[PDB]
Design a protein around this motif. Structure first.
Motif, mmCIF file in Angstrom:
data_model
loop_
_atom_site.group_PDB
_atom_site.id
_atom_site.type_symbol
_atom_site.label_atom_id
_atom_site.label_comp_id
_atom_site.label_asym_id
_atom_site.label_seq_id
_atom_site.Cartn_x
_atom_site.Cartn_y
_atom_site.Cartn_z
ATOM 1 N N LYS A 126 -1.208 4.859 -6.063
ATOM 2 C CA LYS A 126 -1.624 5.755 -4.999
ATOM 3 C C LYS A 126 -2.697 5.138 -4.117
ATOM 4 O O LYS A 126 -3.627 4.490 -4.599
ATOM 5 C CB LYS A 126 -2.145 7.059 -5.616
ATOM 6 C CG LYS A 126 -2.675 8.087 -4.631
ATOM 7 C CD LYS A 126 -3.173 9.325 -5.383
ATOM 8 C CE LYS A 126 -3.820 10.344 -4.450
ATOM 9 N NZ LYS A 126 -2.877 10.861 -3.418
ATOM 10 N N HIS A 127 -2.555 5.336 -2.814
ATOM 11 C CA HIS A 127 -3.533 4.837 -1.876
ATOM 12 C C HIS A 127 -3.419 5.525 -0.528
ATOM 13 O O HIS A 127 -2.328 5.654 0.038
ATOM 14 C CB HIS A 127 -3.406 3.326 -1.674
ATOM 15 C CG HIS A 127 -4.409 2.778 -0.705
ATOM 16 N ND1 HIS A 127 -5.766 2.965 -0.859
ATOM 17 C CD2 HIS A 127 -4.252 2.109 0.462
ATOM 18 C CE1 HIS A 127 -6.403 2.441 0.174
ATOM 19 N NE2 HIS A 127 -5.507 1.915 0.991
ATOM 20 N N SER A 128 -4.563 5.984 -0.037
ATOM 21 C CA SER A 128 -4.654 6.630 1.266
ATOM 22 C C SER A 128 -5.455 5.637 2.105
ATOM 23 O O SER A 128 -6.663 5.492 1.920
ATOM 24 C CB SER A 128 -5.397 7.957 1.146
ATOM 25 O OG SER A 128 -4.715 8.829 0.261
ATOM 26 N N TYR A 169 0.073 6.940 0.427
ATOM 27 C CA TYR A 169 1.163 6.596 -0.473
ATOM 28 C C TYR A 169 0.889 7.041 -1.904
ATOM 29 O O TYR A 169 -0.197 6.820 -2.441
ATOM 30 C CB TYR A 169 1.371 5.081 -0.377
ATOM 31 C CG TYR A 169 2.353 4.438 -1.333
ATOM 32 C CD1 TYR A 169 1.980 4.126 -2.639
ATOM 33 C CD2 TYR A 169 3.617 4.045 -0.897
ATOM 34 C CE1 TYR A 169 2.835 3.424 -3.483
ATOM 35 C CE2 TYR A 169 4.481 3.343 -1.734
ATOM 36 C CZ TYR A 169 4.080 3.030 -3.023
ATOM 37 O OH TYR A 169 4.896 2.281 -3.835
ATOM 38 N N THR A 170 1.880 7.693 -2.501
ATOM 39 C CA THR A 170 1.782 8.170 -3.870
ATOM 40 C C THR A 170 3.123 8.014 -4.561
ATOM 41 O O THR A 170 4.162 8.366 -4.004
ATOM 42 C CB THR A 170 1.390 9.661 -3.939
ATOM 43 O OG1 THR A 170 0.128 9.857 -3.291
ATOM 44 C CG2 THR A 170 1.281 10.110 -5.395
ATOM 45 N N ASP A 195 -8.680 3.817 -4.930
ATOM 46 C CA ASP A 195 -8.459 5.241 -5.116
ATOM 47 C C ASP A 195 -8.682 5.551 -6.595
ATOM 48 O O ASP A 195 -8.098 4.907 -7.474
ATOM 49 C CB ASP A 195 -7.034 5.616 -4.692
ATOM 50 C CG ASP A 195 -6.720 5.180 -3.266
ATOM 51 O OD1 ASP A 195 -6.579 3.961 -3.029
ATOM 52 O OD2 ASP A 195 -6.621 6.054 -2.381
ATOM 53 N N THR A 198 -6.615 3.022 -9.111
ATOM 54 C CA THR A 198 -5.445 2.492 -8.425
ATOM 55 C C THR A 198 -5.824 2.145 -6.985
ATOM 56 O O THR A 198 -7.003 2.041 -6.662
ATOM 57 C CB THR A 198 -4.260 3.507 -8.480
ATOM 58 O OG1 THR A 198 -3.116 2.949 -7.825
ATOM 59 C CG2 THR A 198 -4.635 4.821 -7.822
ATOM 60 N N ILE A 244 -0.010 -3.261 -4.205
ATOM 61 C CA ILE A 244 -0.717 -2.036 -4.556
ATOM 62 C C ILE A 244 -0.672 -1.988 -6.079
ATOM 63 O O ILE A 244 0.367 -2.238 -6.682
ATOM 64 C CB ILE A 244 -0.058 -0.781 -3.915
ATOM 65 C CG1 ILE A 244 -0.904 0.459 -4.231
ATOM 66 C CG2 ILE A 244 1.385 -0.636 -4.384
ATOM 67 C CD1 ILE A 244 -0.444 1.723 -3.532
#
Ligand SMILES: [Co+2]
Ligand SMILES: [Co+2]
Lengths: 620, 620
Positions: free
Chosen positions: A346-348, A356-357, B375, B395, B593
């Motif tokens: 996950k990353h915003s 993104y999740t 995150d 993450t 990621i």
């Protein structure tokens, strides 16, 4: 078709017939162990010859035998007589356990001991336990079982709540003789009951738990072919089952592009020992080698849908042999299912504005066994990111004793007069490695702290070091949580796109290992349990860390003897043996029935892939 | 009505009005932190006066202030002028991070560095980081931020894939001037992109994942009253939220029959530090204090149903203040739901013929936050058997650099020319204990091995030992995985039916603590991260292990200072501070990621109850 298929009822009946035909299975004979042999290294025969190994017990006292047969050709490949007083007794027969309480019921010493305690023999249950190896000369060459008494007030009563301390008997299950009856003194028998289903103790049942529905409208994402070949989210493997080891995983591989990349050739819990730390003569000999002496697979529970396994479950019903060679099915003994596993990645991102999740999932393969008072669950997990994990779940009723008046340093109190001896639950995972093939090596990785100074002026730098284990003699390692020690299994001949050997990192829980004094009988018989990690060179006959015959067997076989060969393990076909376990001081919360306690380990990819292997996971 | 209710948008608006009217919120003023104050010790104070604590920053350089206001009476309780050079700078404002990239864009030195690298300034994103360390004299009590460059080829591009190494700048956010621009040399900017949503990188998306439907036809088993009061399976607690600490649990208690028994008065992650172990002058100062300097609550994500939180979810939308006192709601910033947690207890008893199996469940309370490239997920779990557990999920995108030609001992290679500096993620859980009341004490419990001999002739015995920590000076403890070390918080004045002080046992993961040299700036500023467990006497002003003003503070503040008071903690109102973290050596699998990595701890009842407290759980 598959040479890794489960043993069939027919194969077992065939083994029985071949042995009978060979004159090796008359009425005085019993099958103490029966299992299919894994294929040897390298394609030898044009086709796969199905072979089985059997340990044949003789109820008359004659020497037992180890026999290997070919069910395909209907022949005995080899048959050797076993000198048990030297190499070890065969696993305990389920029918021998009932011999103990029966015999003791007619023994005068036993009856006098019970009468002295005002106990009615008809209400006294006897737990028949493995004898191990100690200082009893008469036990040389004798198949022994030691019995501990518990009182059962009525048919549904939990006898574990009523231990009869200060009393223990030794029994020769073959000659049907009570060799010794030891009474160290009368202890009050704990009076409180431990009936966890009695409303008197449970009180009104909670009505606050709302239902949780877990279902898969379109069915599971994994497929099962050839009866036990699994394929799930890039993973490929075969689920095997052995009466001794229980669930065994074969050919664990991961689909990376247009190629199936092997990771682990065979994974199993090759042994599990439960040593008790109470110095009392009544139990100082108590050590359960559940896998080696009892054969955990033999007692695998039939799992109930909704109770034991929830969700969309696919069952396997492995077949084992009974003591006479007849096939016996363990209905729904193996549960298989996939489950959601929270967030995977996950990353915003502020700069790109993209959020993104992705969720994670794991494939679960398990079985549950019951060894007297305890119940153990064995779980293997496969995650989307390539991580492999094992988890043992220990529950059931703790073994009890009386709680002494002056207190105890090796027993905890659960209820008035009720004690719980300190003990451990230690497992050995045998991992026949195959990282991108059989040419593997193990490196011990330690975090490395650096001193402040030239090149590290701010004193913020820290690194790590990896030490390749090149010989078996240097491959007996200890955990070191403080330095974040881990072990990497890599393939020096297979590199990722960054020119680095591909590998997998083993993460241990770093729990205490065997606590017993190094000179104890148990430290020798359970030598593997004294070290966290062992690495050996693959060999067909090196199956268990404790050797083939654990029951009443001294030290001399297993890991310590394998290691002595000091073979080359640097870029060779190797096997990793990981020791991990639980150390228990029973709490009152563990009575009358203890909640699940867990322990395990996991291996995560380490430069095995060229980038994250889960970028193709959908959002859905 | 609850004194532990979440702050309302109105309360924040009221604080804004109070400050403005008091002339404390001028054009140059900014709110760097705003939070509701917890009730002081003593329920005698009928009718709680809702008070808020505020840190007012002055973009003009004028001394900042700490103001406490009563929203109940609409007055300013107190306002103290802050001397940042002494007690530290205030948290970084989101608007300040922005000024860094804007200022550098007009600085000749910065433009020349970029020109030499042929990088268009309009495509260069600047990651604004806190000073990280305390040293450079020239930074005369200046409020500074450091900037590291990353190239973003296009709007939706992941700049993290393109770090601009050998370049770093320092900026005075208040005087708005670039104090320094360091260019240690040109490093190729990694060419490959790290866009995980780009088909060319993800390849065709998997179509093999079948849906997993998790629902509750009768709704959840927990209830939410007073907006944030939770009750679930005997558990009772209040879920608070602070812009700095994020989710905070209050009054955690367990219903044991007729009485509601307290366990933990307040639980939170009081601090989080991310130290980098790359000795390069470009990053050797890099250290994030996510909680103290950035305020993790401020960047909490809005959790999407079906992506971040699956199943029957109940949300909480906490409100925080912006830099101007305006309330800002974080819609669905907190997820709450219960989930099945496999088998709780199981036993198939031969003697009684009774087969028993019960499922376990856990209550989940969590939130996710984003700190630049990373995150973090913060999860609190409540289990049926009374166990409490916390888990941090790390993450996002790893912080990058160039990978030096010739390799590195402090950076790993993720892609061609792309490096990932080694670092750690270390959390501090502040647990204001209240085991059956505030009279508590902590005991360190170690496994104790015993030598074979008199009283232990067979060498099988092992014990345990407990040592009470009586003074803070002796309450700074280290983990010891080898001896299975744990810490028990008990109440010497409350005993179970076995006349034993009730308690809870803290189980740590025993991960490595701060690796930096003891003489480093980071070891001083984050001293809490050098030891696994600290125990202090409760004090209203001892909130964070690093003090109230972490940003650019010389060090030693927090725990080291609190502990220095050497107060009595043997049967008193105490607070346990547990340090736990992850040590990261980024793998190729972590790029572009990274998959979630976890670390945490748990507390299990230890003689808290009189027997298992889940005997009343139904079979269903
Ligand atoms: Co146990
Ligand atoms: Co990291």
């Amino acid at each position: 078709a598959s040479p890794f298929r489960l043993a069939s009822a027919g194969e077992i009946s065939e083994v029985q017939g071949i042995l009978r035909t060979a004159g090796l299975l008359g009425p005085e004979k019993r099958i103490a162990y029966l299992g299919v042999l894994d294929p040897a290294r390298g394609a030898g025969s044009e086709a796969e010859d199905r072979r089985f190994r059997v340990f044949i017990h003789d109820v008359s006292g004659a020497r037992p035998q180890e026999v290997t047969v070919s069910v395909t050709n209907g022949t005995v490949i080899s048959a050797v007589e076993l000198d048990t007083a030297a190499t070890g007794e065969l696993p305990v027969l389920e029918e021998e356990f009932e011999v103990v309480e029966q015999l003791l019921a007619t023994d005068e010493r036993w009856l006098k001991a019970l009468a002295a305690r005002n106990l009615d023999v008809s209400k006294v249950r006897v737990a028949p336990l493995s004898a191990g190896v100690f200082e009893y000369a008469e036990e040389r060459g004798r198949r022994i079982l030691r019995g501990l008494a518990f009182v059962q007030d009525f048919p549904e009563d939990s006898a574990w709540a009523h231990p009869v301390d200060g009393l223990v008997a030794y029994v020769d299950v073959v000659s049907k003789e009570v060799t010794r009856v030891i009474d160290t003194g009368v202890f009050p028998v704990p009076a409180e009951h431990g009936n966890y289903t009695d409303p008197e103790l449970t009180g009104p049942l909670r009505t606050t738990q709302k239902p949780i529905s877990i279902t898969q409208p379109e069915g599971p994402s994994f497929t099962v072919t050839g009866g036990n070949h699994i394929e799930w989210e890039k993973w490929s493997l075969d689920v095997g089952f052995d009466v001794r080891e229980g669930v065994v995983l074969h050919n664990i591989a991961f689909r990376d592009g247009d190629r199936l990349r092997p990771i682990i050739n065979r994974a199993s819990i090759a042994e599990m020992v439960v040593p008790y730390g109470d110095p009392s003569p009544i139990r100082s000999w108590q050590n359960y080698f559940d896998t080696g002496e009892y054969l955990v697979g033999q007692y695998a529970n039939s799992l109930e849908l909704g109770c034991d396994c929830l969700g969309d479950i696919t069952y396997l019903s492995p077949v084992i042999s009974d003591a006479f060679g007849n096939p016996r099915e363990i209905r729904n003994g193996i549960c298989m299912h996939e489950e959601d596993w929270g967030i995977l990645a996950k990353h915003s991102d502020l700069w790109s504005g993209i959020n993104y999740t992705r969720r994670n999932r794991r494939m679960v393969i398990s079985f549950f066994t019951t060894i007297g008072n305890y119940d153990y669950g064995f779980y293997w997990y496969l995650y989307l990111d390539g991580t492999i994990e094992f988890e043992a779940k220990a529950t059931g009723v703790v073994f009890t004793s009386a709680f002494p008046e002056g207190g105890s340093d090796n027993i905890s109190q659960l209820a008035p007069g009720l004690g719980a001896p300190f003990h451990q639950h230690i497992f050995s995972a045998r991992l026949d490695m195959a990282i991108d093939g059989f040419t593997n090596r193990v490196e011990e990785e330690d975090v490395v702290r650096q001193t402040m100074g030239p090149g590290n002026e701010r004193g913020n730098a820290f690194s790590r070091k990896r030490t390749v284990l090149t010989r078996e003699s240097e491959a007996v390692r200890e955990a070191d949580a403080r330095t974040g020690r881990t072990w990497i299994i890599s393939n020096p001949e297979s590199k990722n796109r960054l020119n680095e050997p591909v590998g997998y990192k083993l993460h241990a829980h770093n729990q205490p290992t065997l606590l017993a004094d190094p000179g104890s009988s148990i430290a020798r018989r359970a030598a593997f349990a004294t070290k966290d990690l062992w690495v050996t060179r693959y060999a067909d006959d090196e199956r268990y860390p404790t050797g083939d015959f654990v029951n009443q067997h001294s030290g001399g076989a297993g890991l310590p003897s394998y290691i002595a060969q000091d073979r080359d393990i640097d870029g060779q076909d190797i096997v990793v043996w990981h020791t991990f376990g639980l150390t228990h001081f029973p709490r009152v919360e563990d009575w009358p029935i203890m909640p699940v306690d867990t322990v395990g380990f996991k291996l995560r990819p380490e430069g095995f892939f060229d980038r994250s292997p889960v970028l193709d996971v959908p959002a859905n």
